[PDB]
Amino acid sequence: GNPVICMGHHAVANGTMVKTLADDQVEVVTAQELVESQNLPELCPSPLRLVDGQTCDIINGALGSPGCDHLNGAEWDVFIERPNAVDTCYPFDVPEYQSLRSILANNGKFEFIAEEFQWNTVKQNGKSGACKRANVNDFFNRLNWLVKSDGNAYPLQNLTKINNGDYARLYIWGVHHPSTDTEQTNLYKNNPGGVTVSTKTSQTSVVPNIGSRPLVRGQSSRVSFYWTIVEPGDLIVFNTIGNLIAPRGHYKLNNQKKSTILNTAIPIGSCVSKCHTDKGSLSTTKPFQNISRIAVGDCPRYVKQGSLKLATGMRNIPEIAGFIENGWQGLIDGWYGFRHQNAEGTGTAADLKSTQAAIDQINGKLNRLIEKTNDKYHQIEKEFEQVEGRIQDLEKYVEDTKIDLWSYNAELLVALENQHTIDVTDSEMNKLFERVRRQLRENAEDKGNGCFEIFHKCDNNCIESIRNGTYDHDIYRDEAINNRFQ
Amino acid sequence: GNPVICMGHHAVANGTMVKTLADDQVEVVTAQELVESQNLPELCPSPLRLVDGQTCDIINGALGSPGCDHLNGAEWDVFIERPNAVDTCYPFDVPEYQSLRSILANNGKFEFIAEEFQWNTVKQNGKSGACKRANVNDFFNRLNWLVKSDGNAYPLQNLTKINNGDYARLYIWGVHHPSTDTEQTNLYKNNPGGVTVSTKTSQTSVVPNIGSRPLVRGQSSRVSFYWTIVEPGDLIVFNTIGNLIAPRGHYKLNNQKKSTILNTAIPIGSCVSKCHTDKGSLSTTKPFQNISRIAVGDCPRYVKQGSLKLATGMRNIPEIAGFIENGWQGLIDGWYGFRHQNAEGTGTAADLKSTQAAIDQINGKLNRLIEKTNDKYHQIEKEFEQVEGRIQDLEKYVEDTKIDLWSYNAELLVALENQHTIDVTDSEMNKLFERVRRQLRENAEDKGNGCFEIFHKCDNNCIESIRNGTYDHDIYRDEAINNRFQ
Amino acid sequence: GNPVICMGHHAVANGTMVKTLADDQVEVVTAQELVESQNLPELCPSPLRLVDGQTCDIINGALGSPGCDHLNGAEWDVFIERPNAVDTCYPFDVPEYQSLRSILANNGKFEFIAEEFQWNTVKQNGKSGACKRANVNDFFNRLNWLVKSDGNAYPLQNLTKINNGDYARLYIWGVHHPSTDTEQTNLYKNNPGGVTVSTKTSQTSVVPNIGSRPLVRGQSSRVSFYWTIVEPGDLIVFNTIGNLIAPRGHYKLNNQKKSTILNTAIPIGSCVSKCHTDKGSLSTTKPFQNISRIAVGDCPRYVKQGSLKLATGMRNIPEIAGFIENGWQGLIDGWYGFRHQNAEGTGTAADLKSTQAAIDQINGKLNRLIEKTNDKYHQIEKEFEQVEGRIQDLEKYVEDTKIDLWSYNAELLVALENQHTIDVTDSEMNKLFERVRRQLRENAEDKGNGCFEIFHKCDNNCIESIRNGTYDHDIYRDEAINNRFQ
Ligand SMILES: *[C@@H]1O[C@H](CO)[C@@H](O)[C@H](O)[C@H]1NC(C)=O
Ligand SMILES: *[C@@H]1O[C@H](CO)[C@@H](O)[C@H](O)[C@H]1NC(C)=O
Ligand SMILES: *[C@@H]1O[C@H](CO)[C@@H](O)[C@H](O)[C@H]1NC(C)=O
Ligand SMILES: *[C@@H]1O[C@H](CO)[C@@H](O)[C@H](O)[C@H]1NC(C)=O
Ligand SMILES: *[C@@H]1O[C@H](CO)[C@@H](O)[C@H](O)[C@H]1NC(C)=O
Ligand SMILES: *[C@@H]1O[C@H](CO)[C@@H](O)[C@H](O)[C@H]1NC(C)=O
């Protein structure tokens, strides 16, 4: 009625507050941050293929403006478009600009196929002071500025290109908008001009608009650019009586389009990462991130929270007594264990089976919190210089809606996991106590503080018999029953 | 101190692995597949109304092209549009094609109301070899091709129709685009022609475009189709000085539009199902499916996972002794039960109350997990032939976002439910053991293996008294206390 | 061997049914409603700034139609647009109506900056009987109707305005569409007219459409309105040969645009609320609401459910006897407690620390069950007069998708929380019973009904001694041991 065996668990000086369904804050021994809030100050050039547009945005790249030559033949997973990109060529606009930019970016290559267009009588290769290369008048190198002949002729043009190849063709073409009637006739004889470009099942017809626009690189006139996709088995017809800015060929479209574009001033570095934001690449295994909604590649999901801590250990209670409202700061080789008091003295030993059982159920969630990949490339635009109305409203609402739902998911997930982690570790403690209870049977009594009073002589070999489960109560039953009740 | 009663639970040789918050794989006695991964090879024409466009897509159906007669008067919940649909009439285009298609599909019927249009002087009922009907030159039968009089006159047209009914009217009309100036005047005298169609609050004006398009069904010319909706209390005015393809009347719009369209080659069968995918109908009560994101009617939610298994039973531990050990493959008449060994021999019996408690908390899930039915009809397009740019990017991103969120919900739901199912069945096992402990009082001791050693003689009818809760402990107390401590 | 101490919990005659993972309906002692299903019959003008359009919708307010002067200088968080608003001025349309309406509403102010436009030779300030102001012919007061000179001339207009300020400018301008060729030349001499408005990087060109349209306020002619945003450092050029409806200046755009518009007939009251629906303001702290998907401000999230009940107490079991059989309606000053029977009689007192522990885990739940915000202003349109096709389909699908996901989140959240609530309160009952058992040691036996049979003389400050944890077991031990076993 003297030796005592106590059951307990580890503890630390002070651990980490986490969140459960019950408490807003519970202290636990260990925990892990689930939100990545650090980013690299650069973009990683591998394993994804990045192409730097440099001074050239992707639209000026497709057109072949001065300064964009480095993009001829380029192929990318991610086109890196620079906010300080500048226009170097004839002033132009693109109706549905954003859609052409999307298509070009998503296609993922600039593979241009020259074609001979046998324009009739008109002069070709018109060039401009608004589009110099090294101070020589020039023009977009994928386009061909047609003007009237020396004999003051611009006949109806009528050229067909048939696609019997195995890829869809992208043709980019334009309409010139002069500033005066005199400019219109000086360039194209006819007034008005006009352009119709058609396939079997679609058509674009454009009438030029004559008028003064703001001066840009000395020019008040403009080009408007259009595009036409021609599928295998289809064909394209160019018709004009003036003002056509003609293609010199077509771009090849990939059947599968899986690339995208990222607009950012962040330099390309030397690191390795498959996740890129507009702030730079992330190098992380965390499931969430609060760095930017703009994220391309294999990325954590964007959430609003700055921090979410996942418990990776039991409730922490610091400070002859077992578990019951003390933890053992001295237990450092296990999660649970035995502390005893007999004739030879005292000792503390870790229990492996319960310790492993807790770890398995808690490092059970550490394999599946980290497995779904979220590998995403072409998405939607998510920031905007100026308001546009209905479509931008929807783009913004869709993204806001998505972020709020994932933020909620993240919040709920961690609270649920932590509640489960606490319940599991509390349960494993109780299971250890109950295991010992069953071993002792009638040879001991519950002291109420997580300890058993053992009513018989129990030396260190006997204590160990309890700890390793070889203790036979029958050996000590007579001795114990007699000491208990008399 | 000799008879024994043991508390246990059933088990089987081959269990099923499921997922919880803890383990990737916990074996349980029974489980249920929550993802439908099988489909029917056909579409079921009951209980929803399916209309098969056959060779006629819905736009050609509305126009009245040859081969679309079967659609006259049709009404549908789902219009089945065929990928092998073919054009059978004059080559045409529709600005905002996708939106007219959506409106026609969503409306759910072709109820055409003919109207007398008193066109002045111009000839009516133009026909074409490009649109033959039973080997005779003809035209879209909802449209009226107006051309100049024999006297070479096409006067300014000016007709009004007032909507004094109680439904909104859909008028479909077109503009013919000639290939040459000669054609333009041959047909319409004037050059240019022109069309304006207006109501009180809206207007559409179209100028014909003249030029060479690719030859289709013998024609380089084209018709462009437009539409105008006329609400009750409004009215429509048609003016033209040439090139008008006039309506013969209007379609009735339903006030409530709740139908849709499914593009698929899958045959319509003879089966019964309210859930249709582009791969065929589903016949299922599962809450999720991985067959296709394109799903109309009363359908499981589309998810990325191929399988999600819901535990419908307790942990499975194969291989007298109690539950601490293992389960009892011999217990086939309940979930929990008693196994005993006395002077008369052994035996195994089920406990109904514990079994039924567990089942109530599990099949309960099984009813509120196939929850409410996700009845959806007109949604958005989810497959595309070729990239379009901004709007298509958003449609794809919206769907991808939705699918990832539901896939996440499905994953978490099954793990949460499975964790609860295991917790409940574990709990019910313990409550049975604790029930029996309180019956036995001081007349028995815990053997540690889920069994009680009963310290008095206990025959098959004393055992039954324990199993059905009539055992009075005071009857045996003295004999038991005696055998225990002396 | 006959005093008894019982452990129990409270109960009530009438409780509330809630839903868990396990049960379709568990009755609990207390619960709360999480779905707000009541609204105020008015809009609260505090603390958000509401501006009532009254008879003017926001487009007519921007144009400066008669009756809209009250909106000059207005600033709003939410513009309240009335469905019975009426047109008071020249019949007009706006090609991208919804996008101008969005930009105006989102910008959040009408701050017009007048500019002098030195139009050349043309007459200014055209007025109309269709736009009377105080019963004299007038016009939109932000616009300037230019017509030909008395010399019968309309020379090319070519005016430039430079944005050298620090805010973006919104210019609203129009194009007049006459009804006959005679009207065209009567008003503008030239036929056709024409308008081009451009900046450095954008342009809009419009050809007027001539033709008969339904008479609206005596007019068959129309105006189409367009807009042009001019960033600081940019400039705008107006160029026309007739039919231009000229701006009188520009609206100031905020850099940060965070306001919105709510279309509703609901009157503005005198209450206080930061949540507004089209049905009226809400005054609630619930997390969810089923009143309307249209909700602006700091609002509960819209869900499909009419009711979701969150358990705020333990299970209700209504009706010597401990917690096993049932709870105690008589216990009205705590959640858990002791009931005894002595020599000196019977008695009930509540246990503090058990009651508190349960409340901390449950009150804890709902101060951050309703937590964050849902602070949303400019969103998307969610109700539509008539079908439009592709964009409207996507808007509706996006909102439907959102609502289903939040409705699922709410359902799961309440089921999970309620399960945890019931588990916690069951747990604390058991912890209480085990606390006492650990005190009594060998001086009592578990009667099986949540009570202990104490095997010794125990007076009322022996009973009290147990309740405040002072009870020393070895004081009575051998008295007890003796009546237990002999
Ligand atoms: C030129 O146009 C005519 C129709 O007027 C067409 O038949 C012919 O194929 C066209 N030629 C080319 C080279 O496109
Ligand atoms: C992301 O979280 C960190 C804290 O982890 C915070 O300092 C930072 O401001 C956050 N980023 C935001 C709010 O954009
Ligand atoms: C024809 O036009 C005149 C004026 O242009 C108009 O008064 C009349 O209502 C029009 N008739 C119809 C049937 O629209
Ligand atoms: C759907 O799931 C099954 C497994 O149940 C899988 O075999 C099939 O390929 C899946 N369908 C897909 C991935 O399209
Ligand atoms: C008018 O047009 C001329 C050229 O046509 C241009 O140089 C001038 O800047 C324009 N003036 C204004 C005020 O826009
Ligand atoms: C909202 O819920 C209440 C019940 O709480 C119900 O009576 C009301 O009809 C609901 N509103 C709807 C369905 O629009």
PDB file of C-alpha atoms and ligand atoms in Angstrom, chain C residues 37 290-291 304-307, ligand 6:
ATOM      1  CA  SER C  37     -36.034  35.796 -42.035  1.00  0.00           C
ATOM      2  CA  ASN C 290     -33.129  34.150 -46.570  1.00  0.00           C
ATOM      3  CA  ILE C 291     -34.693  37.495 -47.444  1.00  0.00           C
ATOM      4  CA  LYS C 304     -31.818  29.013 -49.313  1.00  0.00           C
ATOM      5  CA  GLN C 305     -32.791  27.635 -45.868  1.00  0.00           C
ATOM      6  CA  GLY C 306     -35.620  29.281 -43.935  1.00  0.00           C
ATOM      7  CA  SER C 307     -34.223  28.121 -40.599  1.00  0.00           C
TER       8      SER C 307
HETATM    9  C1  LIG D   6     -37.572  32.598 -45.209  1.00  0.00           C
HETATM   10  O1  LIG D   6     -37.755  31.719 -44.087  1.00  0.00           O
HETATM   11  C2  LIG D   6     -39.038  31.800 -43.446  1.00  0.00           C
HETATM   12  C3  LIG D   6     -39.006  30.820 -42.296  1.00  0.00           C
HETATM   13  O2  LIG D   6     -38.019  31.181 -41.344  1.00  0.00           O
HETATM   14  C4  LIG D   6     -40.133  31.466 -44.449  1.00  0.00           C
HETATM   15  O3  LIG D   6     -41.402  31.581 -43.813  1.00  0.00           O
HETATM   16  C5  LIG D   6     -40.037  32.392 -45.654  1.00  0.00           C
HETATM   17  O4  LIG D   6     -40.999  31.995 -46.622  1.00  0.00           O
HETATM   18  C6  LIG D   6     -38.637  32.315 -46.269  1.00  0.00           C
HETATM   19  N1  LIG D   6     -38.514  33.239 -47.387  1.00  0.00           N
HETATM   20  C7  LIG D   6     -38.482  32.847 -48.665  1.00  0.00           C
HETATM   21  C8  LIG D   6     -38.586  31.371 -48.902  1.00  0.00           C
HETATM   22  O5  LIG D   6     -38.377  33.652 -49.592  1.00  0.00           O
END
